[PDB]
Design an enzyme around this catalytic site. Structure first.
Site, PDB file in Angstrom:
ATOM      1  N   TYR A   1      -4.457   4.122  19.513  1.00 38.92           N
ATOM      2  CA  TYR A   1      -4.020   4.534  18.188  1.00 38.92           C
ATOM      3  C   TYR A   1      -3.910   6.070  18.117  1.00 38.92           C
ATOM      4  O   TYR A   1      -2.881   6.629  17.696  1.00 38.92           O
ATOM      5  CB  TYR A   1      -5.006   4.057  17.111  1.00 38.92           C
ATOM      6  CG  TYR A   1      -4.662   4.669  15.752  1.00 38.92           C
ATOM      7  CD1 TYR A   1      -3.606   4.151  14.972  1.00 38.92           C
ATOM      8  CD2 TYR A   1      -5.394   5.776  15.252  1.00 38.92           C
ATOM      9  CE1 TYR A   1      -3.293   4.689  13.742  1.00 38.92           C
ATOM     10  CE2 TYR A   1      -5.082   6.331  14.015  1.00 38.92           C
ATOM     11  CZ  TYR A   1      -4.014   5.791  13.282  1.00 38.92           C
ATOM     12  OH  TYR A   1      -3.675   6.334  12.090  1.00 38.92           O
TER      13      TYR A   1
ATOM     14  N   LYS B   1      -0.620   8.463  17.426  1.00 39.52           N
ATOM     15  CA  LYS B   1      -0.471   9.465  16.327  1.00 39.52           C
ATOM     16  C   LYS B   1      -0.213  10.902  16.847  1.00 39.52           C
ATOM     17  O   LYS B   1       0.585  11.644  16.267  1.00 39.52           O
ATOM     18  CB  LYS B   1      -1.604   9.373  15.321  1.00 39.52           C
ATOM     19  CG  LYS B   1      -1.572   8.069  14.519  1.00 39.52           C
ATOM     20  CD  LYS B   1      -0.322   8.073  13.612  1.00 39.52           C
ATOM     21  CE  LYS B   1      -0.507   7.115  12.437  1.00 39.52           C
ATOM     22  NZ  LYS B   1       0.748   6.697  11.759  1.00 39.52           N
TER      23      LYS B   1
ATOM     24  N   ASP C   1      -1.717  11.495  10.751  1.00 42.81           N
ATOM     25  CA  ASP C   1      -3.129  11.174  10.475  1.00 42.81           C
ATOM     26  C   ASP C   1      -3.887  12.484  10.532  1.00 42.81           C
ATOM     27  O   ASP C   1      -3.796  13.208  11.528  1.00 42.81           O
ATOM     28  CB  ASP C   1      -3.658  10.175  11.503  1.00 42.81           C
ATOM     29  CG  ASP C   1      -5.088   9.684  11.188  1.00 42.81           C
ATOM     30  OD1 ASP C   1      -5.915  10.467  10.673  1.00 42.81           O
ATOM     31  OD2 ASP C   1      -5.377   8.500  11.465  1.00 42.81           O
TER      32      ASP C   1
ATOM     33  N   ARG D   1       0.802  -1.222   0.000  1.00 39.43           N
ATOM     34  CA  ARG D   1       0.000   0.000   0.000  1.00 39.43           C
ATOM     35  C   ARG D   1       0.832   1.266   0.000  1.00 39.43           C
ATOM     36  O   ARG D   1       1.588   1.485  -0.931  1.00 39.43           O
ATOM     37  CB  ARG D   1      -1.016  -0.042   1.143  1.00 39.43           C
ATOM     38  CG  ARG D   1      -1.976  -1.214   1.042  1.00 39.43           C
ATOM     39  CD  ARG D   1      -2.262  -1.815   2.407  1.00 39.43           C
ATOM     40  NE  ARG D   1      -2.924  -0.843   3.270  1.00 39.43           N
ATOM     41  CZ  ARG D   1      -4.225  -0.537   3.228  1.00 39.43           C
ATOM     42  NH1 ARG D   1      -5.054  -1.139   2.374  1.00 39.43           N
ATOM     43  NH2 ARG D   1      -4.703   0.389   4.057  1.00 39.43           N
TER      44      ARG D   1
ATOM     45  N   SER E   1      16.500  14.369   5.621  1.00 37.50           N
ATOM     46  CA  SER E   1      15.207  14.640   6.237  1.00 37.50           C
ATOM     47  C   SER E   1      14.492  13.345   6.673  1.00 37.50           C
ATOM     48  O   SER E   1      14.799  12.231   6.195  1.00 37.50           O
ATOM     49  CB  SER E   1      14.318  15.472   5.284  1.00 37.50           C
ATOM     50  OG  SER E   1      13.714  14.621   4.300  1.00 37.50           O
TER      51      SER E   1
ATOM     52  N   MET F   1      -3.570   8.190  20.488  1.00 38.52           N
ATOM     53  CA  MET F   1      -2.482   8.632  21.365  1.00 38.52           C
ATOM     54  C   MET F   1      -1.136   8.529  20.671  1.00 38.52           C
ATOM     55  O   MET F   1      -0.297   9.426  20.817  1.00 38.52           O
ATOM     56  CB  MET F   1      -2.488   7.803  22.658  1.00 38.52           C
ATOM     57  CG  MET F   1      -3.662   8.153  23.592  1.00 38.52           C
ATOM     58  SD  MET F   1      -3.866   6.973  24.953  1.00 38.52           S
ATOM     59  CE  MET F   1      -2.406   7.378  25.893  1.00 38.52           C
TER      60      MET F   1
HETATM   61  N1  LIG Z   1      -4.853   3.869   4.960  1.00 38.33           N
HETATM   62  C1  LIG Z   1      -5.270   5.102   5.286  1.00 38.33           C
HETATM   63  O1  LIG Z   1      -6.256   5.590   4.772  1.00 38.33           O
HETATM   64  C2  LIG Z   1      -4.554   5.942   6.308  1.00 38.33           C
HETATM   65  C3  LIG Z   1      -5.264   6.915   7.002  1.00 38.33           C
HETATM   66  C4  LIG Z   1      -4.625   7.720   7.948  1.00 38.33           C
HETATM   67  C5  LIG Z   1      -3.273   7.527   8.186  1.00 38.33           C
HETATM   68  N2  LIG Z   1      -2.593   6.565   7.514  1.00 38.33           N
HETATM   69  C6  LIG Z   1      -1.158   6.393   7.818  1.00 38.33           C
HETATM   70  O2  LIG Z   1      -0.400   6.155   6.629  1.00 38.33           O
HETATM   71  C7  LIG Z   1       0.670   5.207   6.881  1.00 38.33           C
HETATM   72  C8  LIG Z   1       0.671   4.038   5.892  1.00 38.33           C
HETATM   73  O3  LIG Z   1      -0.677   3.694   5.545  1.00 38.33           O
HETATM   74  P1  LIG Z   1      -1.116   2.159   5.186  1.00 38.33           P
HETATM   75  O4  LIG Z   1      -2.611   1.975   5.322  1.00 38.33           O
HETATM   76  O5  LIG Z   1      -0.407   1.783   3.919  1.00 38.33           O
HETATM   77  O6  LIG Z   1      -0.452   1.331   6.416  1.00 38.33           O
HETATM   78  P2  LIG Z   1      -0.973  -0.100   6.997  1.00 38.33           P
HETATM   79  O7  LIG Z   1      -1.391  -0.932   5.808  1.00 38.33           O
HETATM   80  O8  LIG Z   1      -1.933   0.104   8.153  1.00 38.33           O
HETATM   81  O9  LIG Z   1       0.400  -0.691   7.603  1.00 38.33           O
HETATM   82  C9  LIG Z   1       1.643  -0.407   6.962  1.00 38.33           C
HETATM   83  C10 LIG Z   1       2.670  -1.464   7.322  1.00 38.33           C
HETATM   84  O10 LIG Z   1       3.156  -1.262   8.649  1.00 38.33           O
HETATM   85  C11 LIG Z   1       3.717  -2.510   9.081  1.00 38.33           C
HETATM   86  N3  LIG Z   1       3.453  -2.863  10.496  1.00 38.33           N
HETATM   87  C12 LIG Z   1       2.278  -2.883  11.155  1.00 38.33           C
HETATM   88  N4  LIG Z   1       2.443  -3.318  12.432  1.00 38.33           N
HETATM   89  C13 LIG Z   1       3.755  -3.603  12.595  1.00 38.33           C
HETATM   90  C14 LIG Z   1       4.641  -4.117  13.680  1.00 38.33           C
HETATM   91  N5  LIG Z   1       4.162  -4.428  14.911  1.00 38.33           N
HETATM   92  N6  LIG Z   1       5.959  -4.265  13.381  1.00 38.33           N
HETATM   93  C15 LIG Z   1       6.476  -3.972  12.172  1.00 38.33           C
HETATM   94  N7  LIG Z   1       5.741  -3.519  11.147  1.00 38.33           N
HETATM   95  C16 LIG Z   1       4.410  -3.316  11.300  1.00 38.33           C
HETATM   96  C17 LIG Z   1       3.128  -3.649   8.220  1.00 38.33           C
HETATM   97  O11 LIG Z   1       4.179  -4.347   7.522  1.00 38.33           O
HETATM   98  P3  LIG Z   1       4.226  -5.946   7.208  1.00 38.33           P
HETATM   99  O12 LIG Z   1       2.992  -6.048   6.334  1.00 38.33           O
HETATM  100  O13 LIG Z   1       5.554  -6.120   6.532  1.00 38.33           O
HETATM  101  O14 LIG Z   1       4.114  -6.748   8.477  1.00 38.33           O
HETATM  102  C18 LIG Z   1       2.119  -2.897   7.344  1.00 38.33           C
HETATM  103  O15 LIG Z   1       1.932  -3.460   6.044  1.00 38.33           O
HETATM  104  C19 LIG Z   1       0.487   4.723   8.313  1.00 38.33           C
HETATM  105  O16 LIG Z   1       1.442   5.302   9.216  1.00 38.33           O
HETATM  106  C20 LIG Z   1      -0.916   5.162   8.682  1.00 38.33           C
HETATM  107  O17 LIG Z   1      -1.045   5.392  10.091  1.00 38.33           O
HETATM  108  C21 LIG Z   1      -3.199   5.783   6.579  1.00 38.33           C
HETATM  109  N1  LIG Z   2      -2.437   2.187   9.549  1.00 38.41           N
HETATM  110  C1  LIG Z   2      -3.574   2.875   9.400  1.00 38.41           C
HETATM  111  N2  LIG Z   2      -3.793   4.080   9.929  1.00 38.41           N
HETATM  112  N3  LIG Z   2      -5.005   4.571   9.644  1.00 38.41           N
HETATM  113  C2  LIG Z   2      -5.755   3.766   8.880  1.00 38.41           C
HETATM  114  C3  LIG Z   2      -6.996   4.064   8.518  1.00 38.41           C
HETATM  115  C4  LIG Z   2      -7.733   3.265   7.662  1.00 38.41           C
HETATM  116  N4  LIG Z   2      -9.053   3.643   7.358  1.00 38.41           N
HETATM  117  C5  LIG Z   2      -9.625   4.799   7.913  1.00 38.41           C
HETATM  118  C6  LIG Z   2      -8.880   5.588   8.772  1.00 38.41           C
HETATM  119  C7  LIG Z   2      -7.576   5.199   9.062  1.00 38.41           C
HETATM  120  N5  LIG Z   2      -6.787   5.887   9.870  1.00 38.41           N
HETATM  121  S1  LIG Z   2      -4.939   2.383   8.546  1.00 38.41           S
END
Ligand SMILES: NC(=O)c1ccc[n+]([C@@H]2O[C@H](COP(=O)([O-])OP(=O)(O)OC[C@H]3O[C@@H](n4cnc5c(N)ncnc54)[C@H](OP(=O)(O)O)[C@@H]3O)[C@@H](O)[C@H]2O)c1
Ligand SMILES: Nc1nnc(-c2cnccc2N)s1
Ligand SMILES: NC(=O)c1ccc[n+]([C@@H]2O[C@H](COP(=O)([O-])OP(=O)(O)OC[C@H]3O[C@@H](n4cnc5c(N)ncnc54)[C@H](OP(=O)(O)O)[C@@H]3O)[C@@H](O)[C@H]2O)c1
Ligand SMILES: NC(=O)c1ccc[n+]([C@@H]2O[C@H](COP(=O)([O-])OP(=O)(O)OC[C@H]3O[C@@H](n4cnc5c(N)ncnc54)[C@H](OP(=O)(O)O)[C@@H]3O)[C@@H](O)[C@H]2O)c1
Ligand SMILES: NC(=O)c1ccc[n+]([C@@H]2O[C@H](COP(=O)([O-])OP(=O)(O)OC[C@H]3O[C@@H](n4cnc5c(N)ncnc54)[C@H](OP(=O)(O)O)[C@@H]3O)[C@@H](O)[C@H]2O)c1
Ligand SMILES: Nc1nnc(-c2cnccc2N)s1
Ligand SMILES: Nc1nnc(-c2cnccc2N)s1
Ligand SMILES: Nc1nnc(-c2cnccc2N)s1
Lengths: 246, 250, 247, 249
Positions: free
Chosen positions: A153, A157, A140, A13, A134, A155
């Protein structure tokens, strides 16, 4: 010659999109993964076919534990071992799930605060100790209007915002900039389907989620020479979602 | 067919760097100015030398008054007259001077200038821009220091705060029309010409990243990003470009 | 020797509840009003029944114009003339209606929405300070970062007021004048159909109801009291958690 | 009839002022402490001499560990066991010291600075709510979170997390009638360790009177938030900083 970047959680992703786009800009990359070995290697294969010996993988659980500091220092080390330098740290790995106030709680603490905040802090410490430099933290946009029952979660972020600002302040004299990118809804997490459309419909800008690539674009900007005076900034990439009232 | 942008207060300093960089990116530009007639004309010459028919000037006072709406309508119209379109509005023109609460212009003139240029004219331009309607967007020049203001600058700070509100309100309202609205918030950049030299180093000392102010070009870079196709999902965001200055405690 | 307070838009709703509670606390009050003469006078009479010569009314339009500065100066002046002092200014009067981006002129909307919500507060604050537990309380808006659609000028006025609150707190702290705000979410509702009222009440996490005017007044009372002597530049949300709720 | 409150790190300084004020308002109080054994008991004596059976002490380390949840559950239990009820929780206990990015191991620093400033508040909030009228929580935050002390990343992270907890818990516990708010000092009682000259450097920056807040001034804001005059307030963090956070570098 070429700069090098560490992207944590880079197998899938948004972390993948980030790694790809940095690579397309001419970075060498450490693809960090925890459970996604096959995807991480497959991405590395794809990048190395494009340019030889420009992508390596690194396995680590980013859960908080007495071994997290060693793991984090090893991630930074892999970048120096492979590439002779580490220019960019992208703190992307993130655990995400509910923890209602009304897995043990201390495991939830370890994953939600550890991966979201403590690993970024440790990675940051190691990245700085070993030194256009950098760090970009994946934040989030909904931090102030949090999801119900997601306190740990949330907290984690908010702690990441604190880290972004504290590290920007302290590392600025080292020429290390520290910024963030805060997604709203990007590609939903597995997660619900009528649920997913409910969200896209709230987004002012085009009633849709980001793509991972739109997230990556912001990262690419912040690491670039076009952001040389920017530090302590967190760029929302949320299509206006955070502006919408209940 | 090249896109077109209006940049207010574009004759000098940051507005100029914004105009230059938009032009280098392929935009045709309306260079708005108020008093800086020579510099404005000079810049349009330079730009047109590089690509003929890609730059015009447009003189207007952005002080609030009952004709401001017409002036703002005219600024937008002029872009359409010269280029057949208007893709980007940059609200950069801004008055900046002390208005102490306990203390040669009347207070109604201070209100009209500080609130007109920094907020009302941006609102009117935004309205004319939207009404007259591709990657459409507006970028507002805000201020990284609005929560830690200069002492005795209440009207200016109020104007910049209003501009933040405009950025969010217009982002929300114009999104279903495909117009994104964002901001760039400088800390210290090119410092007032009227400001002495010891005062400049005082301020440069404060900046964590490199103990200096932003170049006008560094500010423009952020504008460039926000108008670009790399910012297509970005609306309602305000990017600080302050080298960490807003992070520094008293 | 009772302290004295100016409350703008004091005739009805929230400014009424503020003037009442300040009066109950021992303040003499200037009840400012624009159109609501009968209610303003009626409040002053009630209050004066309770304690002789402790309430006066003052009519003024707070729309921005060339006469606004003199209007604001007279409002402050009326408190010194009626009571010999002015300890508290409450900036409460507010216009609120939509101004879409896409039957008053735009410049009249500007005058009303930016005048009442921001410029009159700034002019009143300047007059209050030139004439000097001194403090100012501005009525801000808890939803200023998640605004109602098509309310740009209202939202702009309320952001401006936040800047004023901060700028005045900074500037007037050497003179010992504190400046704070109270930011309602949904309070007494704008008449409106109970079905639509209910839509907003539904959103509020704390009790699924709007704030009473008295609940807003309570926060104003705290900020002006001796219990808030070190508080300045602060804006207290009184919104039952509404601003915490995502779309 | 009398309500009861838990106040963490209540033996000295701001937590003491808070327990004293809540006591003067008619609360029975659990004085939580960690090392300040003598000061805690001395305080409970004083209070109990004013009205008897109105103060207990409760010793606990609020460092994060696999037994923190038990300790926090026990703190809340203290209050029910002593007083039959728990009306208010003040999360005041806080570790504060530098953790430069460039004695204690780093995992001990994470555990003390994140545990006391955020994890224990989250656990205490969870137990307070599970055990359940004017119920509220007040978290002691920091007005300077966005302009942090240099080299204090872990402390600053903990205080930011505490802001997210404040908001998340206000939101989640509103349906149960529990309000959650915060109070954010700038400079108040300075550390005992701090020299006088260094103290005055900080005093000088404060626009409102060029002095730190008294512990009592911090307590006043807590007293307001728990009061019936704050019945509609939840998710709010009130700065009590004399304008310090408004001052540019
Ligand atoms: N998706 C959204 O809409 C959204 C919304 C708000 C914020 N964000 C932020 O954007 C960033 C990336 O988004 P995303 O949805 O692509 O991320 P995600 O799918 O929730 O997770 C990203 C990767 O983090 C790794 N991870 C999770 N727990 C772990 C642990 N205990 N140890 C080591 N690795 C771990 C996993 O790697 P492995 O698969 O290799 O285990 C996972 O594939 C995140 O920081 C998220 O908080 C995303
Ligand atoms: N790692 C993730 N952090 N936020 C995620 C997310 C997924 N869908 C809606 C809101 C979200 N924050 S997934
Ligand atoms: N410079 C900094 O350190 C800094 C810091 C924070 C924010 N900013 C913001 O960044 C933007 C650009 O900064 P800057 O220093 O380049 O601005 P500036 O030089 O102070 O002003 C830019 C232009 O605004 C125009 N202007 C002033 N009053 C006007 C009026 N009544 N009507 C029409 N135009 C008027 C002037 O045009 P003429 O010369 O043609 O008369 C001026 O050249 C501004 O919005 C400013 O508020 C700058
Ligand atoms: N009610 C809410 O839910 C809510 C939500 C967020 C913020 N607020 C804020 O809380 C404060 C009080 O709320 P409210 O609902 O009681 O206010 P409101 O009823 O909308 O207005 C308050 C008073 O302001 C006066 N006013 C309006 N336009 C004026 C002008 N041009 N010149 C002079 N006075 C004028 C009116 O006085 P006359 O009647 O005498 O003409 C009116 O009674 C306001 O600052 C408001 O913005 C309220
Ligand atoms: N003082 C200021 O200027 C200031 C500025 C900003 C924010 N604040 C916040 O306001 C609150 C009160 O400030 P303060 O200066 O009174 O606090 P403080 O004296 O630094 O700490 C209060 C108490 O925290 C307890 N504590 C520390 N580590 C602990 C642990 N590992 N386990 C359990 N308890 C522990 C201690 O109790 P024992 O002594 O019993 O061991 C200490 O007495 C704090 O949350 C602080 O962060 C204060
Ligand atoms: N138009 C302008 N707005 N702000 C300016 C400025 C100049 N130096 C320091 C801070 C400033 N805001 S110039
Ligand atoms: N003067 C006013 N300011 N805000 C008002 C209001 C009324 N109903 C819903 C939201 C509001 N802000 S009325
Ligand atoms: N526990 C504590 N948290 N913050 C403290 C403090 C002491 N001096 C200056 C600033 C501070 N935050 S003590």
């Amino acid at each position: 010659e070429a700069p090098a970047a560490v992207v944590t959680g880079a197998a899938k992703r948004i972390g993948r999109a980030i790694a790809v786009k940095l690579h397309q800009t001419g970075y060498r990359v450490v693809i960090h993964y925890h459970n996604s070995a096959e995807a991480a290697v497959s991405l590395a294969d794809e990048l190395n076919k494009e340019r030889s010996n420009t992508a390596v993988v690194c396995q680590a659980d980013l859960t908080n534990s007495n071994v997290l500091p060693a793991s984090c220092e090893e991630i930074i080390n892999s970048c120096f071992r492979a590439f002779g330098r580490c220019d960019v740290l992208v703190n992307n790995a993130s655990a995400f799930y509910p923890t209602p106030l009304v897995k043990t709680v201390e495991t939830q603490v370890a994953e939600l605060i550890g991966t979201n905040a403590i690993a970024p802090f440790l990675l940051t410490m190691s990245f700085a100790q070993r030194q256009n430099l950098s760090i970009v933290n994946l934040c989030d946009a909904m931090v102030d209007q949090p999801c119900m029952a997601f306190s740990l979660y949330n907290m984690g972020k908010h702690a990441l915002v604190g880290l972004t600002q504290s590290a920007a302040l302290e590392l600025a004299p080292y020429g290390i900039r520290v910024n963030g990118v805060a997604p709203g809804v990007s590609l939903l997490p597995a997660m619900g389907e009528e649920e997913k459309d409910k969200w896209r419909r709230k987004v002012p800008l085009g009633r849709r989620e980001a793509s991972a690539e739109q997230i990556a674009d912001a990262v690419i900007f912040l690491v670039s020479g076009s952001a040389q005076y920017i530090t302590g900034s967190i760029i929302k990439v949320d299509g206006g979602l955070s502006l919408v009232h209940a």
